[PDB]
């Protein structure tokens, strides 16, 4: 019985070791955040437009000016290889088959170059800055291997307090690898190569990365650049002012700050203020959640745990199945609300509850 | 202990096979819709008018200009024969004994002509359009057999995602029949009779039926015409503008779109805007639910599952009993709020919570 | 462990037959009303006034111009003799010992005259009109035996639909008696005495008793007259306009109409509009509930089930104990909010939640 | 698994006798107050400021003009010696090691002088007035032994109705001592020394202590003076007008009046009106609760049960551990919301829910 995302979560929980399941499903502190991320979608209900010809519907849409099958993307998640063998490639290939982008994490188990060599879909790279020099190395690496878009994740200045991991003394799987940091030499001694090595021997990232640092990254990267982890129209607007081509409103799936607002709470305001592409994630499970955000102005929605449940439960085929269900879900919803063309979605189809 | 509608649901659940019970009780996806349909009635409470002579009360009222015993109707539901033998006739006869209309579904188990020959009450016909030509055949059939009112159901452009059925692999009972589509020939070959046969071999309806298509239906039908499945004052008004004599605000009992608003949410607005008869269904179980809608301007309320629980539990007598309880319920409520004549109901008896 | 009203309810439930307990605790239909009656008190919280000398507090107050120990009364309840032997007298004597009025029901087990002969406290009489002539007989009977105040209950035009009784086929106890209707002759034949006898052979009251009928009652009774069962500032005001000296906002403890508003919802408005004594009941269990109503302008609060739990659990002593706890409760609350004199209570001590 | 305050409560409940645990955890009457104290923090969520350099954070802050490690204090609680041997000293020493003040209760198990002789941290004294003369004795005693700040608790004019204690017939432990009242002589006879002895033989305090009485206390004490137990901007302002250097908004951890508002409800208003230091307690358990109050203008937050769980569970080390977790918690939160310097907190980081 695999008819929705919840069905896959249930199967994933039966197949994954508890420690791994908790690493995936867990949130920060009391987990009021993940619950809120889900609950907030109930603040909106649909007001369908009847007697509209929906015999011919289209989910196709442009994201950052480029067309894709539907306004979805498989977002950046670390240690996918812990959920399923070659998880990164499984996810990437399922996304490509579906006609949507896949975003590779800086903490992926498969390197930037290898995935680019094994998958010819639209690949994006999510950047975490631990060491400026090292980050610059990954950015150029992604540029030269053909990644089309760069995503800077800014909501991990410090690691989230996820108590499930603390209780399980969660340790990154033994057979796993932080490939992107592989071969970053050593044995060298001097300012850097000593200041760099010590930065790599730390589970914390660059907590000083600021606006000036963003400009730096902006000149380094030539293609589309998005800033991820924003929770205010003000920051979204500032990013556009600094060179960003768009943003990704997100609270990291409730894994960083338990009492953070849901990005859905500032979506409309960010769309109205920035006037630029506003993507979003955190809490999406049903096709209706997705349609509600799109109707509020979101350019696209990134999937986090949703597609990971498919991966952990049934590998690549599992990811394919979740994407198939979600697309049909989105399609079905568009038909029932009377909006045949997804790009025609507006707040007019919603009712504030 | 059969003192209310819930008591009949309980009995129906004990007597029906789980698959059939789930077909009846089930809703779309998470079933937040059916729960909302019930919960929304709690947004209103009564402010009784004391010291009013209610020794002589009247539930009689005009619906579309024609008088009936009370502002209730047994709405259109498919496969009633799966709940109880000759369910369609049981429901029709109970409605007639009570003095209210019965609406026959396009997917009923007893044909349009047979029911008209076995029941002389006020019979209405609910139309689903799968094939324009076939629909025209049923419409004329209903006209010639004496049906007084036609109801166009517009909220099934696509089938609702009801997961209970998916889990039970629900298949329309073997002893059941889609009588109205009986004898629609075959063996014929050409444009239609090939385009028509393929349409009949599909569980999906005409998703292209639009406003122009409604005008078409308007000229075809001479008597009262209602459009069912509306969830906005705007669409209700548009229907009146296109020829409709009234509308039926409904979310199909939460069986089509889980996150749809409850029709109660747009009832007052639809009444104020259209200035025409506004009927409503979805979520009604208690006499108070009914009185609240009537007080907000509804012309009448259609019963869906309420009377079906009586049917599945105790057949025709069961339907009679539910209608008797509801009428006494409505009567009792009118007395306790100080409104002896049902047609005197106004929002003045309500308090927004 | 009898430290509050809930503790007495628990004991009463252990000592009373289920049928009797359900007759007492039960409410109409779904019992959302009784739950609401309790929940509504949470819409207000206290904002204590610190550094106020509360070493000398007073709960004494005038009700309808007459002083009593505290702003409480034991309200009218029928069949008290079913909860405890000579329940009516037990309640009356406990009220008198506490220094507050006791209201006798028209459906009490002890007659108007007998209680007046066995209790010398402030006795009030609650009138139910089944037969005008019979009612007039009881009114004059109460006048001549020394009852100080008459209370007309207007919210029982029809009997409430209490399903607990239906399930238990609740029948008024065999050893009980409707004393006030005793000796109303028979064997007589003519217009009345035949129209009167048939009215007595009916469990329903005079559903036609209206405003004109109230004027009738107003001229018949010389002392203080209150109208009970009101749920709107408009009706409260109309009663004052017709001669009433005050009103009692009430929904009959949620026993008549499940979806009725709580009288607390119109308390402030009734106080502001009528400018006359506004008493109230329904849902009061804690001293804080009482203080909140008093702070909103209520002249006094009538106890229903609260003191009945004491009666059913431990008879007269039980009633004494509940009143003692409530008084100390009220006293304690006044001290903690900084309002030493109960007559100084105002909305300034409250916070709307 | 001791990763947060709740983990310590759980351990404390396993180690303490039920009667003692109930004395600590219990609240007044229905305990809706303690639940509300917790729930109210959910009315605010965070709106982090991204791309801010938080590599260098500071929790240091001035409280009443004096710098301390972080805006926290271990508030006044009675009978700490019942939770752990020499509990008062354990708490005082843990507070000092952490760099924050400890407030000694008038009902502590260790005397004013002894703690001052065994701990050289910033010690504050919380005053309860039972006898003016006796109170004056303690005040001067605290002054001469080096206590820096005096705190007048005004919300115990009468003892709270805590039913857990009533059910357990809670009696102050046999090995415990009300040290501060030790050696207050006897055997003396005359006005006082007879009026004083009778006051000491009473579990109730001076319910007459008013504004004039506060002026009296103001002239008696030369250093910083705070008034604790306020629940309105009006009273907070009045205290400043009477000489107070600041206030402590508090509902005594829901132990005095179950329906009292949470001090969080009047925090912003008190800050805006008084323009003086506004401290607060009641319901704080997570670092986020603390940060929310600080962001609303609170000078500091006093811990009650939070650090008591550490004490009862693991003594002094337990208190150290709770303070360490809370500090890291506060630090982590500041980083995740983009506010490196705690004194830079403003309502701009919050979202009203
Ligand atoms: C197991 C797991 C690992 C994650 N790793 C990363 C990462 O390496 N980079 C990043 O930008 N976000 C990371 N995220 C956050 C996601 O990109 C996304 O914001 C989040 O999962 C969205 O919420 P949802 O899980 O409810 O869909 C992770 C989330 C999960 C559940
Ligand atoms: C078993 C079942 C079958 C239904 N079949 C039809 C149908 O054939 N035509 C139609 O217009 N509505 C159909 N409906 C919807 C009803 O007309 C009505 O909108 C709905 O049941 C109202 O909600 P309620 O069930 O809460 O009363 C069906 C509902 C149920 C429960
Ligand atoms: C067992 C029972 C019998 C009652 N009988 C009467 C009656 O004879 N006359 C009347 O005016 N109200 C009657 N009432 C209503 C009370 O006067 C009062 O409105 C109600 O109990 C107040 O609510 P509470 O029970 O929550 O306090 C009755 C209530 C109960 C619980
Ligand atoms: C066991 C216990 C004893 C207390 N004793 C006192 C006291 O002696 N003096 C005082 O001012 N407050 C006293 N308080 C109240 C605290 O100072 C503080 O207001 C309260 O605990 C804050 O709420 P919290 O427990 O949720 O942190 C006590 C609280 C508890 C839990």
PDB file of N, CA and C in Angstrom, chain A residues 29-30 32-33 36 154-155 157-161 163 166-167 169 207-211 214 229-232 235 239 256-261 265-266, chain D residues 1-4 7 38 41-42 44-57 286-288 292 325 329 332-333 335-337 351-353:
ATOM      1  N   UNK A  29      15.469  20.169  18.972  1.00  0.00           N
ATOM      2  CA  UNK A  29      14.871  20.176  20.298  1.00  0.00           C
ATOM      3  C   UNK A  29      13.512  19.488  20.484  1.00  0.00           C
ATOM      4  N   UNK A  30      12.460  20.246  20.772  1.00  0.00           N
ATOM      5  CA  UNK A  30      11.147  19.639  21.020  1.00  0.00           C
ATOM      6  C   UNK A  30      10.380  19.169  19.787  1.00  0.00           C
ATOM      7  N   UNK A  32       8.745  21.004  17.709  1.00  0.00           N
ATOM      8  CA  UNK A  32       7.498  21.745  17.547  1.00  0.00           C
ATOM      9  C   UNK A  32       7.594  22.365  16.146  1.00  0.00           C
ATOM     10  N   UNK A  33       8.831  22.529  15.678  1.00  0.00           N
ATOM     11  CA  UNK A  33       9.075  23.120  14.377  1.00  0.00           C
ATOM     12  C   UNK A  33       8.590  22.255  13.234  1.00  0.00           C
ATOM     13  N   UNK A  36       4.934  22.226  13.245  1.00  0.00           N
ATOM     14  CA  UNK A  36       4.419  23.497  12.751  1.00  0.00           C
ATOM     15  C   UNK A  36       4.527  23.567  11.224  1.00  0.00           C
ATOM     16  N   UNK A 154      22.702  29.130   4.129  1.00  0.00           N
ATOM     17  CA  UNK A 154      23.105  30.043   5.189  1.00  0.00           C
ATOM     18  C   UNK A 154      22.550  29.783   6.592  1.00  0.00           C
ATOM     19  N   UNK A 155      21.753  28.730   6.775  1.00  0.00           N
ATOM     20  CA  UNK A 155      21.167  28.492   8.095  1.00  0.00           C
ATOM     21  C   UNK A 155      21.840  27.457   8.984  1.00  0.00           C
ATOM     22  N   UNK A 157      25.067  28.180  10.628  1.00  0.00           N
ATOM     23  CA  UNK A 157      26.216  28.886  11.195  1.00  0.00           C
ATOM     24  C   UNK A 157      26.736  28.022  12.339  1.00  0.00           C
ATOM     25  N   UNK A 158      25.802  27.352  13.007  1.00  0.00           N
ATOM     26  CA  UNK A 158      26.094  26.423  14.094  1.00  0.00           C
ATOM     27  C   UNK A 158      25.176  25.219  13.859  1.00  0.00           C
ATOM     28  N   UNK A 159      25.562  24.061  14.381  1.00  0.00           N
ATOM     29  CA  UNK A 159      24.773  22.845  14.206  1.00  0.00           C
ATOM     30  C   UNK A 159      23.505  22.859  15.060  1.00  0.00           C
ATOM     31  N   UNK A 160      22.404  22.390  14.478  1.00  0.00           N
ATOM     32  CA  UNK A 160      21.145  22.335  15.200  1.00  0.00           C
ATOM     33  C   UNK A 160      21.203  21.334  16.343  1.00  0.00           C
ATOM     34  N   UNK A 161      20.458  21.611  17.410  1.00  0.00           N
ATOM     35  CA  UNK A 161      20.425  20.736  18.576  1.00  0.00           C
ATOM     36  C   UNK A 161      19.357  19.658  18.386  1.00  0.00           C
ATOM     37  N   UNK A 163      18.185  16.342  19.471  1.00  0.00           N
ATOM     38  CA  UNK A 163      18.286  15.413  20.586  1.00  0.00           C
ATOM     39  C   UNK A 163      18.158  13.922  20.255  1.00  0.00           C
ATOM     40  N   UNK A 166      21.603  12.859  19.786  1.00  0.00           N
ATOM     41  CA  UNK A 166      22.282  12.858  21.078  1.00  0.00           C
ATOM     42  C   UNK A 166      21.961  11.580  21.843  1.00  0.00           C
ATOM     43  N   UNK A 167      20.694  11.182  21.816  1.00  0.00           N
ATOM     44  CA  UNK A 167      20.265   9.967  22.496  1.00  0.00           C
ATOM     45  C   UNK A 167      20.837   8.713  21.837  1.00  0.00           C
ATOM     46  N   UNK A 169      23.654   8.832  20.092  1.00  0.00           N
ATOM     47  CA  UNK A 169      25.085   9.077  19.918  1.00  0.00           C
ATOM     48  C   UNK A 169      25.377   8.874  18.436  1.00  0.00           C
ATOM     49  N   UNK A 207      30.843  30.546  10.622  1.00  0.00           N
ATOM     50  CA  UNK A 207      29.786  31.337  11.236  1.00  0.00           C
ATOM     51  C   UNK A 207      29.931  32.833  10.956  1.00  0.00           C
ATOM     52  N   UNK A 208      31.002  33.207  10.266  1.00  0.00           N
ATOM     53  CA  UNK A 208      31.253  34.610   9.953  1.00  0.00           C
ATOM     54  C   UNK A 208      30.831  34.987   8.538  1.00  0.00           C
ATOM     55  N   UNK A 209      30.441  33.998   7.738  1.00  0.00           N
ATOM     56  CA  UNK A 209      30.043  34.272   6.361  1.00  0.00           C
ATOM     57  C   UNK A 209      28.891  35.269   6.367  1.00  0.00           C
ATOM     58  N   UNK A 210      29.180  36.481   5.891  1.00  0.00           N
ATOM     59  CA  UNK A 210      28.210  37.572   5.859  1.00  0.00           C
ATOM     60  C   UNK A 210      27.910  38.097   4.462  1.00  0.00           C
ATOM     61  N   UNK A 211      27.275  39.270   4.410  1.00  0.00           N
ATOM     62  CA  UNK A 211      26.890  39.902   3.152  1.00  0.00           C
ATOM     63  C   UNK A 211      28.077  40.189   2.250  1.00  0.00           C
ATOM     64  N   UNK A 214      29.103  37.145   0.696  1.00  0.00           N
ATOM     65  CA  UNK A 214      28.180  36.754  -0.370  1.00  0.00           C
ATOM     66  C   UNK A 214      28.583  37.421  -1.695  1.00  0.00           C
ATOM     67  N   UNK A 229      17.782  29.204   3.034  1.00  0.00           N
ATOM     68  CA  UNK A 229      17.721  29.321   4.481  1.00  0.00           C
ATOM     69  C   UNK A 229      17.148  30.629   5.003  1.00  0.00           C
ATOM     70  N   UNK A 230      16.526  31.408   4.118  1.00  0.00           N
ATOM     71  CA  UNK A 230      15.941  32.688   4.499  1.00  0.00           C
ATOM     72  C   UNK A 230      14.559  32.529   5.124  1.00  0.00           C
ATOM     73  N   UNK A 231      14.242  33.426   6.055  1.00  0.00           N
ATOM     74  CA  UNK A 231      12.964  33.401   6.747  1.00  0.00           C
ATOM     75  C   UNK A 231      12.364  34.795   6.936  1.00  0.00           C
ATOM     76  N   UNK A 232      12.656  35.689   5.996  1.00  0.00           N
ATOM     77  CA  UNK A 232      12.124  37.048   6.035  1.00  0.00           C
ATOM     78  C   UNK A 232      12.195  37.690   4.645  1.00  0.00           C
ATOM     79  N   UNK A 235      15.439  39.789   4.294  1.00  0.00           N
ATOM     80  CA  UNK A 235      16.673  39.113   3.899  1.00  0.00           C
ATOM     81  C   UNK A 235      16.602  38.676   2.441  1.00  0.00           C
ATOM     82  N   UNK A 239      19.314  39.819  -0.408  1.00  0.00           N
ATOM     83  CA  UNK A 239      20.051  38.881  -1.252  1.00  0.00           C
ATOM     84  C   UNK A 239      19.960  39.303  -2.714  1.00  0.00           C
ATOM     85  N   UNK A 256      17.110  22.948  12.380  1.00  0.00           N
ATOM     86  CA  UNK A 256      18.058  23.908  12.931  1.00  0.00           C
ATOM     87  C   UNK A 256      17.588  24.707  14.149  1.00  0.00           C
ATOM     88  N   UNK A 257      16.381  25.260  14.075  1.00  0.00           N
ATOM     89  CA  UNK A 257      15.825  26.074  15.155  1.00  0.00           C
ATOM     90  C   UNK A 257      14.363  25.670  15.336  1.00  0.00           C
ATOM     91  N   UNK A 258      14.066  24.999  16.438  1.00  0.00           N
ATOM     92  CA  UNK A 258      12.708  24.528  16.674  1.00  0.00           C
ATOM     93  C   UNK A 258      11.589  25.580  16.603  1.00  0.00           C
ATOM     94  N   UNK A 259      11.852  26.792  17.092  1.00  0.00           N
ATOM     95  CA  UNK A 259      10.836  27.847  17.109  1.00  0.00           C
ATOM     96  C   UNK A 259      10.858  28.810  15.934  1.00  0.00           C
ATOM     97  N   UNK A 260      11.548  28.432  14.867  1.00  0.00           N
ATOM     98  CA  UNK A 260      11.603  29.278  13.684  1.00  0.00           C
ATOM     99  C   UNK A 260      10.223  29.281  13.038  1.00  0.00           C
ATOM    100  N   UNK A 261       9.912  30.352  12.320  1.00  0.00           N
ATOM    101  CA  UNK A 261       8.640  30.419  11.624  1.00  0.00           C
ATOM    102  C   UNK A 261       8.736  29.463  10.439  1.00  0.00           C
ATOM    103  N   UNK A 265       5.008  31.372   6.078  1.00  0.00           N
ATOM    104  CA  UNK A 265       4.556  32.583   6.765  1.00  0.00           C
ATOM    105  C   UNK A 265       5.037  33.903   6.150  1.00  0.00           C
ATOM    106  N   UNK A 266       6.125  33.850   5.384  1.00  0.00           N
ATOM    107  CA  UNK A 266       6.673  35.039   4.737  1.00  0.00           C
ATOM    108  C   UNK A 266       6.739  34.909   3.211  1.00  0.00           C
TER     109      UNK A 266
ATOM    110  N   UNK D   1      21.013  10.182  29.753  1.00  0.00           N
ATOM    111  CA  UNK D   1      20.510  11.157  28.736  1.00  0.00           C
ATOM    112  C   UNK D   1      20.019  12.456  29.358  1.00  0.00           C
ATOM    113  N   UNK D   2      20.952  13.339  29.683  1.00  0.00           N
ATOM    114  CA  UNK D   2      20.602  14.618  30.272  1.00  0.00           C
ATOM    115  C   UNK D   2      21.046  15.721  29.311  1.00  0.00           C
ATOM    116  N   UNK D   3      20.182  16.005  28.339  1.00  0.00           N
ATOM    117  CA  UNK D   3      20.468  16.999  27.313  1.00  0.00           C
ATOM    118  C   UNK D   3      19.625  18.268  27.389  1.00  0.00           C
ATOM    119  N   UNK D   4      18.695  18.316  28.337  1.00  0.00           N
ATOM    120  CA  UNK D   4      17.851  19.498  28.512  1.00  0.00           C
ATOM    121  C   UNK D   4      17.189  19.503  29.888  1.00  0.00           C
ATOM    122  N   UNK D   7      14.878  16.559  30.836  1.00  0.00           N
ATOM    123  CA  UNK D   7      15.601  15.351  31.208  1.00  0.00           C
ATOM    124  C   UNK D   7      15.926  15.359  32.699  1.00  0.00           C
ATOM    125  N   UNK D  38       3.704  27.633  30.147  1.00  0.00           N
ATOM    126  CA  UNK D  38       4.510  26.953  29.129  1.00  0.00           C
ATOM    127  C   UNK D  38       3.988  27.267  27.729  1.00  0.00           C
ATOM    128  N   UNK D  41       4.606  30.666  25.391  1.00  0.00           N
ATOM    129  CA  UNK D  41       5.814  30.909  24.609  1.00  0.00           C
ATOM    130  C   UNK D  41       5.616  30.568  23.134  1.00  0.00           C
ATOM    131  N   UNK D  42       4.599  29.760  22.841  1.00  0.00           N
ATOM    132  CA  UNK D  42       4.326  29.365  21.462  1.00  0.00           C
ATOM    133  C   UNK D  42       3.633  30.465  20.667  1.00  0.00           C
ATOM    134  N   UNK D  44       4.959  33.141  20.042  1.00  0.00           N
ATOM    135  CA  UNK D  44       6.067  33.803  19.351  1.00  0.00           C
ATOM    136  C   UNK D  44       6.979  32.784  18.667  1.00  0.00           C
ATOM    137  N   UNK D  45       7.421  33.125  17.460  1.00  0.00           N
ATOM    138  CA  UNK D  45       8.348  32.292  16.708  1.00  0.00           C
ATOM    139  C   UNK D  45       9.468  33.200  16.213  1.00  0.00           C
ATOM    140  N   UNK D  46      10.589  32.604  15.835  1.00  0.00           N
ATOM    141  CA  UNK D  46      11.741  33.367  15.374  1.00  0.00           C
ATOM    142  C   UNK D  46      11.809  33.646  13.877  1.00  0.00           C
ATOM    143  N   UNK D  47      12.337  34.823  13.560  1.00  0.00           N
ATOM    144  CA  UNK D  47      12.571  35.262  12.187  1.00  0.00           C
ATOM    145  C   UNK D  47      14.059  35.630  12.161  1.00  0.00           C
ATOM    146  N   UNK D  48      14.926  34.617  12.009  1.00  0.00           N
ATOM    147  CA  UNK D  48      16.381  34.774  11.965  1.00  0.00           C
ATOM    148  C   UNK D  48      16.869  35.773  10.923  1.00  0.00           C
ATOM    149  N   UNK D  49      17.980  36.434  11.231  1.00  0.00           N
ATOM    150  CA  UNK D  49      18.601  37.385  10.319  1.00  0.00           C
ATOM    151  C   UNK D  49      19.824  36.646   9.795  1.00  0.00           C
ATOM    152  N   UNK D  50      19.761  36.249   8.526  1.00  0.00           N
ATOM    153  CA  UNK D  50      20.833  35.497   7.878  1.00  0.00           C
ATOM    154  C   UNK D  50      22.015  36.341   7.435  1.00  0.00           C
ATOM    155  N   UNK D  51      23.093  35.649   7.082  1.00  0.00           N
ATOM    156  CA  UNK D  51      24.319  36.284   6.613  1.00  0.00           C
ATOM    157  C   UNK D  51      24.884  37.348   7.547  1.00  0.00           C
ATOM    158  N   UNK D  52      24.807  37.053   8.840  1.00  0.00           N
ATOM    159  CA  UNK D  52      25.335  37.914   9.888  1.00  0.00           C
ATOM    160  C   UNK D  52      26.498  37.134  10.486  1.00  0.00           C
ATOM    161  N   UNK D  53      27.613  37.816  10.734  1.00  0.00           N
ATOM    162  CA  UNK D  53      28.780  37.167  11.314  1.00  0.00           C
ATOM    163  C   UNK D  53      28.523  36.899  12.794  1.00  0.00           C
ATOM    164  N   UNK D  54      28.340  35.627  13.135  1.00  0.00           N
ATOM    165  CA  UNK D  54      28.092  35.237  14.519  1.00  0.00           C
ATOM    166  C   UNK D  54      29.211  34.336  15.028  1.00  0.00           C
ATOM    167  N   UNK D  55      30.409  34.518  14.477  1.00  0.00           N
ATOM    168  CA  UNK D  55      31.568  33.728  14.879  1.00  0.00           C
ATOM    169  C   UNK D  55      32.050  34.160  16.255  1.00  0.00           C
ATOM    170  N   UNK D  56      31.636  35.351  16.673  1.00  0.00           N
ATOM    171  CA  UNK D  56      32.018  35.890  17.975  1.00  0.00           C
ATOM    172  C   UNK D  56      30.757  36.388  18.678  1.00  0.00           C
ATOM    173  N   UNK D  57      30.229  35.574  19.588  1.00  0.00           N
ATOM    174  CA  UNK D  57      29.005  35.918  20.309  1.00  0.00           C
ATOM    175  C   UNK D  57      29.258  36.259  21.774  1.00  0.00           C
ATOM    176  N   UNK D 286      13.260  26.307  28.188  1.00  0.00           N
ATOM    177  CA  UNK D 286      14.158  26.261  27.026  1.00  0.00           C
ATOM    178  C   UNK D 286      14.890  27.582  26.814  1.00  0.00           C
ATOM    179  N   UNK D 287      16.065  27.520  26.190  1.00  0.00           N
ATOM    180  CA  UNK D 287      16.824  28.729  25.906  1.00  0.00           C
ATOM    181  C   UNK D 287      16.020  29.686  25.039  1.00  0.00           C
ATOM    182  N   UNK D 288      15.137  29.135  24.207  1.00  0.00           N
ATOM    183  CA  UNK D 288      14.293  29.942  23.329  1.00  0.00           C
ATOM    184  C   UNK D 288      13.249  30.737  24.124  1.00  0.00           C
ATOM    185  N   UNK D 292      13.143  34.768  23.902  1.00  0.00           N
ATOM    186  CA  UNK D 292      11.917  35.461  23.505  1.00  0.00           C
ATOM    187  C   UNK D 292      11.587  36.599  24.460  1.00  0.00           C
ATOM    188  N   UNK D 325      23.918  23.792  30.188  1.00  0.00           N
ATOM    189  CA  UNK D 325      23.046  23.491  29.058  1.00  0.00           C
ATOM    190  C   UNK D 325      22.279  24.729  28.618  1.00  0.00           C
ATOM    191  N   UNK D 329      22.520  26.708  25.224  1.00  0.00           N
ATOM    192  CA  UNK D 329      21.225  26.762  24.548  1.00  0.00           C
ATOM    193  C   UNK D 329      20.997  28.205  24.086  1.00  0.00           C
ATOM    194  N   UNK D 332      23.518  29.091  21.367  1.00  0.00           N
ATOM    195  CA  UNK D 332      23.147  28.441  20.116  1.00  0.00           C
ATOM    196  C   UNK D 332      21.999  29.184  19.431  1.00  0.00           C
ATOM    197  N   UNK D 333      21.007  29.582  20.223  1.00  0.00           N
ATOM    198  CA  UNK D 333      19.842  30.296  19.710  1.00  0.00           C
ATOM    199  C   UNK D 333      20.236  31.665  19.149  1.00  0.00           C
ATOM    200  N   UNK D 335      23.022  32.538  17.886  1.00  0.00           N
ATOM    201  CA  UNK D 335      23.719  32.299  16.629  1.00  0.00           C
ATOM    202  C   UNK D 335      22.744  31.990  15.489  1.00  0.00           C
ATOM    203  N   UNK D 336      21.774  31.121  15.756  1.00  0.00           N
ATOM    204  CA  UNK D 336      20.809  30.735  14.741  1.00  0.00           C
ATOM    205  C   UNK D 336      19.818  31.816  14.315  1.00  0.00           C
ATOM    206  N   UNK D 337      19.634  32.841  15.146  1.00  0.00           N
ATOM    207  CA  UNK D 337      18.723  33.935  14.803  1.00  0.00           C
ATOM    208  C   UNK D 337      19.506  35.146  14.290  1.00  0.00           C
ATOM    209  N   UNK D 351       8.066  36.874  15.659  1.00  0.00           N
ATOM    210  CA  UNK D 351       6.878  36.839  14.818  1.00  0.00           C
ATOM    211  C   UNK D 351       5.739  36.432  15.743  1.00  0.00           C
ATOM    212  N   UNK D 352       4.698  37.255  15.820  1.00  0.00           N
ATOM    213  CA  UNK D 352       3.557  36.944  16.668  1.00  0.00           C
ATOM    214  C   UNK D 352       2.735  35.871  15.984  1.00  0.00           C
ATOM    215  N   UNK D 353       2.403  34.824  16.725  1.00  0.00           N
ATOM    216  CA  UNK D 353       1.623  33.733  16.169  1.00  0.00           C
ATOM    217  C   UNK D 353       0.207  33.765  16.720  1.00  0.00           C
TER     218      UNK D 353
END
